Design a protein around this nucleic acid. Structure first.
Ligand SMILES: [K+]
Ligand SMILES: [K+]
Ligand SMILES: [K+]
Ligand SMILES: [Mg+2]
Ligand SMILES: [Mg+2]
Length: 136
RNA sequence: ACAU
DNA sequence: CGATGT
């Protein structure tokens, strides 16, 4: 319908999928970058999208902000709602870091509360989410 | 099919 | 063209 401009938008970026994963959050209205995660050597698109949302929740909670979060990822929105990231990525030495971060994000969801609405960014109607990396 |  | 997900 109408974009809620008073919001936080998040997105993953990658080099390969699976591959190097990063993410960032921006002010939807202005494009100001509010947070960025240092690249993680191996992860998936969906793990990164999940981590981005959870980080947004933690960022907004620490700041006493009731703004919603936009994500373009149907998968990650569902994983956050379920508090469970149902990733197929093998757990081995190479993927230990991304799985550690995912496990820690689930743990945070299971021990904290929030009212933040997590909303689907309607890419087909609005174009790319404002946190996008411009790599496609 | 749809969403990345 | 390849991949990750519901
Ligand atoms: K997109
Ligand atoms: K991109
Ligand atoms: K598919
Ligand atoms: Mg995205
Ligand atoms: Mg993007």
């Amino acid at each position: 319908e109408e974009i809620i401009w008073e919001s936080l938008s998040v997105d993953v970026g990658s080099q390969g999928n699976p591959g190097i994963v990063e993410y960032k959050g921006v002010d939807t209205k202005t494009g100001e970058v509010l947070f960025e995660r240092e690249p993680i050597p191996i992860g998936t698109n969906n793990m990164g999208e999940f981590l981005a949302i959870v980080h947004g929740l933690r960022y907004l909670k620490e700041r006493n902000s009731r703004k919603p979060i936009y994500s373009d990822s149907q998968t990650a929105i569902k994983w956050v709602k379920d508090k469970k990231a149902k990733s197929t990525l093998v757990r081995n030495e190479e993927t230990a870091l991304i799985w550690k971060l995912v496990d820690e994000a689930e743990e945070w969801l299971n021990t904290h509360t929030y009212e933040t609405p997590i909303l689907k960014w309607q890419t087909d109607k609005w174009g790319e989410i404002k946190a996008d990396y411009g790599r496609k």
